[PDB]
């Protein structure tokens, strides 16, 4: 009851008690970590969420970044489990934190999940990514983030300050910067954070490993079923420009 009220660097939060067969777990869902990347800020690197008055309602998952919704086999569990379970929004840069119900007295190692989805889809809120059983069982802290996908994350006109590429990764980094500054208010240990991610989530992990500004924000890395060096996970500059120019032609942008 008092375990569900936490204050991070930019304001106060209210969480929710999650039941597990093993016992309960404290969850803080939908924590803003970036100012909404809208209007003039579409295609631009994220800005850190400025402090807020009052208590943020961290009771339930926030929105899902704008993405194509699969329609090959409609209604089919095998494809709908990967589909959005919240409203779509450009206002989606939110992260989630799970922590053991007796907030750990000693700092606890913390795992950070990056969802996959070919870099065009995905959402921290999928039921498959529920962190409560992992926290219940192993008594660690678990953090997942949303990051812009599709052209909202990765459209690039290389060389231009107006669409520079890679801002979906940059969303991920800012959330890693957030965990470093704030995970300790939930019991986490900033000096032992482990990245883990599947598919393009794994390729993302790969690239924080290869990007010096990221390699101060984590200490060990789990790649499941993907790698940054795959044929599909990066693209040349010439080719990203070619694909961005074609999208704008298809959309009527002269």
């Amino acid at each position: 009851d008092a375990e569900l009220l936490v204050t991070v660097r930019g304001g106060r939060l209210r969480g929710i008690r999650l039941k597990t067969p093993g016992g309960p777990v404290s969850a803080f869902l939908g924590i803003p970590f970036a100012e909404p990347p809208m209007g003039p800020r579409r295609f631009l690197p994220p800005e850190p969420k400025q402090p807020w008055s009052g208590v943020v309602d961290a009771t339930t998952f926030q929105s899902v970044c704008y993405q194509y919704v699969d329609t090959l086999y409609p209604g089919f569990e095998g494809t709908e489990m990967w589909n959005p379970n919240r409203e779509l929004s450009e206002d989606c840069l939110y992260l989630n934190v799970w922590t053991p119900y007796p907030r750990p007295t000693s700092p606890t190692p913390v795992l950070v999940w990056i969802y996959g989805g070919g870099f065009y889809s995905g959402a921290s809120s999928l039921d498959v990514y529920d962190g409560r059983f992992l926290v219940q069982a192993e008594r660690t802290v678990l953090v997942s983030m949303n990051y812009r996908v599709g052209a909202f994350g990765f459209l690039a006109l290389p060389g231009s300050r107006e669409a520079p590429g890679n801002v979906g990764l940059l969303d991920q980094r800012l959330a890693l910067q957030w965990v470093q500054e704030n995970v300790a208010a939930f019991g986490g240990d900033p000096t032992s954070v482990t990245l883990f991610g599947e598919s393009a989530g794994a390729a993302s992990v790969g690239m924080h490993l290869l990007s010096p500004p990221s390699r101060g924000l984590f200490h060990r890395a789990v790649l499941q079923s993907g790698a940054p060096n795959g044929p599909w996970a990066t693209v040349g500059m010439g080719e990203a420009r070619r694909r961005a120019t074609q999208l704008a032609h298809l959309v009527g942008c002269p």
């Binding site: 067969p21 209007g39 579409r42 295609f43 704008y66 194509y68 090959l72 089919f76 095998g78 990967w82 190692p109 996959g116 070919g118 870099f119 498959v128 990514y129 992992l134 219940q136 069982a137 192993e138 996908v149 599709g150 052209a151 990765f154 690039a156 290389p158 060389g159 231009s160 669409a163 590429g165 890679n166 990764l169 940059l170 883990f196 599947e198 393009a200 790969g206 690239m207 290869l210 060990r220 789990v222 790649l223 499941q224 079923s225 993907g226 790698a227 060096n229 795959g230 044929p231 996970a233 990066t234 693209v235 040349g236 080719e239 694909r243 120019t245 999208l247 298809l250 959309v251 942008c253």
Partner: protein, 282 residues
């Protein structure tokens, strides 16, 4: 002030988000499966250079890494574009469907380079068995896009100071809704690493809960110590580190851990070593 790049983007910002999404798939260069149109870019900023080049020249002393693939990485992708494939039948494709399917799984590649894929991946005593061909294409896609990239990364971190552990996840969920020919498809370890079988509502088997609890413990262990193994428990089967020479991984399924050797060594030699030389000399 206008320039022209600034023009392009200022206009794209006026479009409703849903308008952009509906034209997303239309910018791909060829027909293809396991291609996505807006992905990270080698701009020189976030990536200093190509992820390959970074790996080759990296120093990874002080890093522990846990990597792995599922048994059938390619079966999922096939039904999203491959001639003759479907969730709803057995996908017993024809040879001409298979050859066409290879140009889609391996797009943007020369003719002779697809000859080489056909050479490596057909059974020239049964060139036309539909079942063997389904499996073969499921391997062309899964290998070229997941396994051999993972295995290149893993051997190369290991040989340059990292401490790596590898797995093949090869349990098929009792709850799985895809058809049986797909096997253990891409993405179907996650249910277990996150321990969903523990959720009473999802109707998982009692042995499967144990598998997830057991599988959670390797992941937590790795997070804590950088080593999936139990430190005070030596008498349970050790999971050895992957190295460029011995190439050991473990099998994660309902059976106790089994150590295996070589991560599709024979195939990944084609994808990671010979194919590049062939595209580069033609």
């Amino acid at each position: 002030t206008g320039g022209n790049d600034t023009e392009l983007v200022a206009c794209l910002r006026t479009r409703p988000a849903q308008v952009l999404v509906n034209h997303e798939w239309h910018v791909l260069p060829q027909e293809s499966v396991f291609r996505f149109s807006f992905v990270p870019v080698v701009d020189g900023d976030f990536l200093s250079d190509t992820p390959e080049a970074l790996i080759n020249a990296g120093d990874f002393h002080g890093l522990q890494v846990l990597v792995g693939v599922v048994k059938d990485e390619g079966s999922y992708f096939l039904v999203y574009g491959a001639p003759g494939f479907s969730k709803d039948n057995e996908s017993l494709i024809s040879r001409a469907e298979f050859l066409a399917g290879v140009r889609v799984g391996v797009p943007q590649v020369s003719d002779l380079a697809a000859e080489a894929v056909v050479l490596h991946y057909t059974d020239w005593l049964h060139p036309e068995d539909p079942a063997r061909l389904r499996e073969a294409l499921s391997d062309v896609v899964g290998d070229h896009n997941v396994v051999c990239p993972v295995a290149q990364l893993a051997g190369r971190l290991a040989a340059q100071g990292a401490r790596v552990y590898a797995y093949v996840f090869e349990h098929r969920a009792s709850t799985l809704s895809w058809p049986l020919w797909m096997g253990v498809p891409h993405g179907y370890e996650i249910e277990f690493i996150f321990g969903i079988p523990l959720d009473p509502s999802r109707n998982y088997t009692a042995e499967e809960k144990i598998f997830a609890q057991r599988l959670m413990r390797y992941w937590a262990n790795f997070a804590r110590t950088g080593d999936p193994n139990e430190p005070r428990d030596p008498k349970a089967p050790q999971w050895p580190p992957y190295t460029a020479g011995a190439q050991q991984y473990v099998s994660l399924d309902l059976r106790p851990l089994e150590v295996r050797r070589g991560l599709r060594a024979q195939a990944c030699a084609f994808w990671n070593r010979f194919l590049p030389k062939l595209l580069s000399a033609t």
